[PDB]
């Protein structure tokens, strides 16, 4: 039985980005979130319960990520170099949950945030969305799996980190980038570096095993891959119009979405498929670059 | 679909662990090894061999448990405050295992290394204890599991943290409370502290899957749990005679497994099953 050996390279990415998670790791204890009160309470109500309720999809995200799809793409890997990076990255996604959590402390009561997460709990389109991606990783839950499914867990998990959390990043991005809630924006910020090079990776991952499939098989993930985008995207837009109608940003978070989901396929070594926010630009300024 | 909210409590323990896996986190570049290599050369060459063997048996175990132990375990938790400190463990432990790799660095030449993981891989002990520990593992790889099953891969993984790393801790803390080598030990502290924590943790939520069997079912894992910490003594004995002859160290290492065994039955709410005796003196100032 094998034990990882990073004195004899496994693939030729892997050690960079151990070194680049590992150099980004912070915890929420870092920022202080609140001196955000102050424009907090300049919010309407409206524009309080959408922050609040894109902040509870965040949160299941990241829990499902790092409790199933970070782990179930890991254990059915055979390069240790690369599981050793998947195991942080899934570690990163707790850190990021518990930092949505610091957020809703500091902007929250007690009753509001239990209220949060029992509308994301029953939420049917976060349900949807959730039970979608996590289908393909539970795929996995067997002794053996074919590349084919280990390639469509992959996919799921690239379209969760480089598309799926977009929707729900816009609107901490869009209020920083006006002044307001700027600490949470930094916690946004931190957590979009780690997600955008988490998608990048497993892009990575998912492209080696792609090659390895025959052709016959490339062909049906194709498809599948392309389904799937396709699917999530109806369930966003869907999802974009019941949280942003009442404060009038739904175009916007559609076309962020579009940007991202352009991204995603990018990461898998695919030709975009759709066509970013001034505002949500500014918010990312604190990153900026990478979009 | 739940997601994990830490302001109700899931439990009265996963907050106070993930404070402090959090708070003890540390990586392989903060301890610098290169001042190790005025007493290694010191050492002889079976010494050196033990040395390198007993950190390739380590880090085969850290492997097994980051990539297997911790992930399937976490994965049919429904506790996700829990969920989310044994990942943060998991990660820790590639972080132990990619610290092995440092020490060998400054310590061995390229070919040198790679001929220790070949005699890891081939090695029919290693791949015997692991093989019955991962097996525990490998029964999670379906998409409903028994609490029976989840409680024995508990075990497992409490005997693994708690007891199979020791055969091979004992060596470095051994050099180290004689001066030698004692930057590599600041390492293996470092990583002994962690594995301290991550084998008490995996011992509650023992205990909590353990309170919800039947009678029926407790009686079972109750005999198998026995039958599982003589099954690896009896290969642990085999290992240390194999590695340790020698140096002349049988006998020492052979008292401190059974010590650590005994820790790990204590985290599981067990009684211990070795003869109780003082951690012998060296190792314990290459604790200090
Ligand atoms: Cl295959
Ligand atoms: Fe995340
Ligand atoms: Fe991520
Ligand atoms: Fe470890
Ligand atoms: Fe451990």
Same mark, same amino acid.
């Given at each position: 039985?094998?034990?990882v050996?990073?004195?004899?390279?496994?693939?030729?990415?892997?050690?960079?980005?151990?070194?680049?998670?590992?150099?980004?790791f912070?915890?929420? =204890?870092?920022?202080?979130?609140?001196?955000?009160?102050?424009?907090?309470?300049?919010?309407?109500?409206?524009?309080? $319960? @959408?922050?609040?309720?894109?902040?509870?999809?965040?949160?299941?995200?990241?829990?499902?990520?790092?409790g199933?799809?970070?782990? +179930?793409?890991?254990?059915? +890997? =055979?390069?240790?170099? @690369?599981?050793?990076?998947?195991?942080?990255?899934?570690?990163?996604?707790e850190?990021?949950?518990?930092?949505?959590?610091?957020?809703?402390?500091?902007?929250?009561?007690?009753?509001?945030?239990?209220?949060?997460?029992?509308?994301?709990?029953?939420?049917?389109?976060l349900?949807?969305?959730?039970?979608?991606?996590?289908?393909?990783?539970?795929?996995? +839950?067997?002794?053996?799996?074919?590349?084919?499914?280990?390639?469509?867990?992959?996919?799921?998990?690239?379209?969760?980190?480089?598309?799926?959390?977009?929707?729900?990043?816009?609107?901490?991005?869009?209020?920083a980038?006006?002044?307001?809630?700027? @600490?949470?924006?930094?916690? $946004?910020?931190?957590?979009?570096?780690?997600?955008?090079?988490?998608?990048?990776?497993?892009?990575?991952? @998912?492209?080696?095993?792609?090659?390895?499939?025959?052709?016959?098989?490339?062909?049906?993930?194709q498809?599948?891959?392309?389904?799937?985008?396709?699917?999530?995207?109806?369930?966003?837009?869907?999802?974009?119009?019941?949280?942003?109608?009442?404060?009038?940003?739904?175009?916007?978070?559609?076309?962020?979405?579009?940007?991202?989901?352009?991204?995603?396929?990018?990461?898998?070594? +695919?030709?975009?498929?759709?066509?970013?926010?001034?505002?949500?630009?500014?918010?990312?300024?604190?990153?900026?670059?990478?979009?």
């Amino acid at each position: 039985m094998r034990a990882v050996n990073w004195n004899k390279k496994e693939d030729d990415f892997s050690l960079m980005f151990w070194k680049q998670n590992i150099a980004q790791f912070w915890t929420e =204890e870092e920022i202080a979130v609140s001196s955000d009160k102050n424009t907090w309470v300049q919010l309407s109500k409206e524009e309080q $319960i @959408a922050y609040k309720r894109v902040l509870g999809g965040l949160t299941l995200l990241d829990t499902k990520q790092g409790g199933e799809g970070m782990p +179930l793409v890991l254990v059915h +890997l =055979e390069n240790l170099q @690369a599981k050793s990076v998947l195991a942080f990255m899934g570690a990163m996604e707790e850190v990021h949950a518990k930092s949505y959590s610091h957020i809703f402390t500091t902007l929250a009561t007690e009753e509001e945030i239990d209220e949060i997460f029992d509308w994301v709990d029953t939420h049917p389109l976060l349900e949807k969305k959730a039970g979608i991606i996590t289908s393909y990783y539970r795929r996995l +839950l067997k002794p053996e799996v074919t590349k084919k499914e280990l390639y469509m867990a992959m996919v799921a998990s690239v379209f969760l980190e480089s598309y799926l959390f977009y929707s729900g990043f816009f609107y901490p991005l869009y209020l920083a980038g006006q002044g307001k809630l700027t @600490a949470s924006g930094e916690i $946004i910020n931190l957590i979009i570096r780690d997600e955008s090079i988490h998608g990048v990776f497993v892009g990575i991952l @998912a492209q080696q095993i792609f090659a390895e499939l025959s052709a016959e098989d490339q062909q049906e993930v194709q498809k599948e891959t392309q389904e799937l985008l396709m699917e999530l995207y109806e369930i966003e837009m869907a999802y974009t119009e019941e949280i942003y109608t009442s404060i009038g940003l739904v175009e916007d978070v559609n076309r962020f979405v579009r940007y991202n989901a352009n991204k995603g396929l990018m990461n898998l070594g +695919l030709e975009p498929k759709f066509e970013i926010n001034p505002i949500v630009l500014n918010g990312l300024r604190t990153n900026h670059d990478f979009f």
